[PDB]
Design a protein around this motif. Structure first.
Motif, mmCIF file in Angstrom:
data_model
loop_
_atom_site.group_PDB
_atom_site.id
_atom_site.type_symbol
_atom_site.label_atom_id
_atom_site.label_comp_id
_atom_site.label_asym_id
_atom_site.label_seq_id
_atom_site.Cartn_x
_atom_site.Cartn_y
_atom_site.Cartn_z
ATOM 1 N N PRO A 7 0.794 -1.364 0.037
ATOM 2 C CA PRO A 7 -0.191 -0.024 0.006
ATOM 3 C C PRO A 7 0.835 1.412 -0.047
ATOM 4 O O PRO A 7 0.481 2.223 -0.736
ATOM 5 C CB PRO A 7 -0.784 -0.114 1.286
ATOM 6 N N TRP A 8 1.815 1.341 0.656
ATOM 7 C CA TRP A 8 2.708 2.703 0.755
ATOM 8 C C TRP A 8 3.465 2.889 -0.307
ATOM 9 O O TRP A 8 4.271 3.974 -0.253
ATOM 10 C CB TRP A 8 3.562 2.418 2.099
ATOM 11 N N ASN A 9 3.556 2.007 -1.405
ATOM 12 C CA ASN A 9 4.357 2.200 -2.736
ATOM 13 C C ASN A 9 3.383 2.467 -3.878
ATOM 14 O O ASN A 9 3.581 2.086 -4.942
ATOM 15 C CB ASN A 9 5.352 1.317 -2.828
ATOM 16 N N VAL A 10 1.902 2.511 -3.589
ATOM 17 C CA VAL A 10 1.107 2.693 -4.571
ATOM 18 C C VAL A 10 0.504 4.031 -4.253
ATOM 19 O O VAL A 10 -0.222 4.350 -3.358
ATOM 20 C CB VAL A 10 0.021 1.566 -4.452
ATOM 21 N N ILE A 30 5.172 3.698 -7.328
ATOM 22 C CA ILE A 30 6.054 4.558 -7.029
ATOM 23 C C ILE A 30 7.432 3.591 -6.463
ATOM 24 O O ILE A 30 7.141 2.536 -6.684
ATOM 25 C CB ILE A 30 5.815 5.730 -6.297
ATOM 26 N N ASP A 31 8.452 4.556 -6.056
ATOM 27 C CA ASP A 31 9.398 3.667 -5.418
ATOM 28 C C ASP A 31 10.209 2.572 -6.194
ATOM 29 O O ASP A 31 10.340 1.561 -6.176
ATOM 30 C CB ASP A 31 8.975 3.147 -4.057
ATOM 31 N N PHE A 32 10.524 3.049 -7.403
ATOM 32 C CA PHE A 32 11.230 2.268 -8.569
ATOM 33 C C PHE A 32 12.697 1.784 -8.512
ATOM 34 O O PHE A 32 13.103 0.934 -9.092
ATOM 35 C CB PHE A 32 11.155 2.930 -9.825
#
Ligand SMILES: Nc1ncnc2c1ncn2[C@@H]1O[C@H](COP(=O)(O)OP(=O)(O)OP(=O)(O)O)[C@@H](O)[C@H]1O
Ligand SMILES: C[S@@+](CC[C@H](N)C(=O)[O-])C[C@H]1O[C@@H](n2cnc3c(N)ncnc32)[C@H](O)[C@@H]1O
Ligand SMILES: [Mg+2]
Ligand SMILES: [Mg+2]
Length: 413
Positions: free
Chosen positions: A343-346, A357-359
């Motif tokens: 959840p915290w990287n969407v 995100i966070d690639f």
């Protein structure tokens, strides 16, 4: 002038426009000026006009006159009468320079500063004396104040290891004086580090912009996983990731330090050249120094799925899941995977469309990541038709599990 220069207790700097005195001067001054003016220009440009500059402990005025020499309106403060008398003499010789000098103490000058008076303040080899006198905590509060009332602060900071009596009073790491400010970056070192600091703007050489908000953790509820070694700054249309490779108090291990390096290089490699047919946020700037690295990218709109779930928001799980499965299939076809889909990287926008995100989580080598996506599906929520979908996937052998297949099966009812 001749007489005023004898009246100096010490000739600290080069005297401006008078090479006759260059042997008597304790400090050669040019290497540090070229770095100071290089930053004057950057911020001048970003603001669109000449700057008001405050030179704290200006000595014989070399840096203030040098800056007045380029349209800057400067003020120079020194607590020695002899120093200012020389400053004004030199200023009178250069009559069209907008240059003014006062006898004062830095503590009081800073105490009396109103916000916006100066865009840039400069503090070279002067705060150590103040740390010795008033202590570390009092100087941090002076520098917070000074950063709050200006756009940028350049500091050259004496260090504890120097063989003088005031050394013992200094903190272990000069970053202890400024780590409470939002943004700092090492811009040089001489014989002593020189830092560019700000509470208002990201100051990278090719990216000089205000920010509205910054944080020392990636998301609500991240805890201290990165030991505070990453800073995130949010502008209007960008996000800046600033990672320190090395921290005060020795808190970052060698492995934590590599992690900050790999993860950032990797993200830059990816976003710089993303696979065709994949909407990835654009790279606006990136670089690194010995201490740190940075990436500035386009700000995607919406909120983290993790926060939407925290606030109990009404979300479209069908739209979030499908869009996320479409891009994971897409990456997979082109040989890419994301190893931290949570959840915290969407990011979810207003139309309930979901993006990663966070690639720096991207790997290029499948079933183990699909398996882990089931945890994500579980965090997202099992009602139907998503129970059928998942059982359909589970009828296949594990070796066959991948995102093309998750997406195919998801498109059937
Ligand atoms: N392109 C972007 N658009 C909008 N917000 C972003 C963008 N990139 C990052 N963010 C925000 O900044 C935060 C940190 O980014 P990111 O998760 O990429 O950093 P990280 O250092 O990899 O942290 P972690 O791996 O611990 O989650 C995100 O949680 C998100 O709030
Ligand atoms: C070592 S010098 C640095 C000079 C100059 N900034 C440079 O780096 O070239 C220190 C200067 O700061 C002044 N100074 C020291 N403490 C001060 C204070 N509390 N208030 C004002 N000036 C101070 C001294 O008079 C001296 O000129
Ligand atoms: Mg993240
Ligand atoms: Mg990450």
């Amino acid at each position: 002038l001749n007489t005023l220069v004898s009246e100096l207790p010490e000739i600290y700097q080069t005297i401006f426009g008078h090479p006759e005195w260059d042997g008597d001067a304790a400090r050669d001054c040019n290497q540090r000026l070229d770095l100071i003016t290089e930053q004057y220009d950057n911020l001048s440009r970003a603001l669109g006009r000449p700057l008001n500059v405050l030179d704290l402990g200006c000595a014989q005025g070399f840096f203030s006159l040098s800056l007045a020499s380029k349209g800057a309106t400067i003020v120079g403060i020194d607590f020695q009468q002899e120093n200012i008398n020389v400053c004004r003499a030199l200023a009178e010789e250069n009559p069209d320079f907008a240059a003014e000098f006062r006898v004062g103490r830095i503590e009081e000058v800073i105490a009396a500063l109103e916000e916006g008076e100066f865009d840039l303040a400069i503090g070279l080899s002067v705060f150590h004396h103040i740390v010795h006198l008033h202590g570390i905590d009092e100087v941090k509060r002076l520098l917070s104040r000074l950063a709050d009332v200006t756009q940028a602060v350049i500091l050259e900071l004496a260090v504890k290891e120097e063989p003088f009596y005031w050394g013992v009073s200094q903190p272990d790491d000069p970053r202890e004086l400024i780590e409470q400010c939002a943004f700092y970056r090492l811009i040089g070192e001489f014989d002593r580090p020189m830092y560019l600091v700000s509470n208002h703007r990201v100051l990278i050489n090719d990216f000089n912009q205000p920010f509205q908000h910054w944080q020392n953790q990636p998301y609500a509820g991240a805890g201290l996983a990165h030991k505070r070694s990453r800073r995130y700054f949010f502008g209007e249309d960008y996000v800046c990731k600033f990672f320190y490779y090395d921290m005060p108090h020795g808190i970052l291990t060698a492995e934590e330090s590599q992690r900050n390096k790999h993860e950032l290089h990797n993200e830059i490699k990816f976003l710089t050249q993303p696979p065709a047919g994949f909407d990835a946020p654009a790279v606006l700037a990136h670089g690194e120094n010995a201490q740190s690295g940075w990436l500035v990218m386009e700000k995607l709109p919406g909120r983290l799925l993790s926060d939407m779930l925290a606030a109990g928001e009404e979300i479209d799980r069908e739209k979030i899941l499908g869009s996320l499965l479409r891009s994971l299939a897409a990456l997979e076809k082109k040989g890419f995977w994301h190893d931290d889909v949570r959840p915290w990287n969407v990011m979810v926008d207003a139309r309930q469309h979901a993006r990663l995100i966070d690639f720096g989580s991207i790997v290029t080598t499948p079933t183990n990541l699909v398996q882990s996506f089931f945890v994500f599906v579980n965090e997202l929520f099992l009602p139907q038709p998503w129970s059928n979908w998942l059982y359909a996937v589970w009828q296949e052998p594990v070796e066959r599990w991948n995102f093309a297949l998750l997406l195919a099966l998801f498109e059937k009812k």
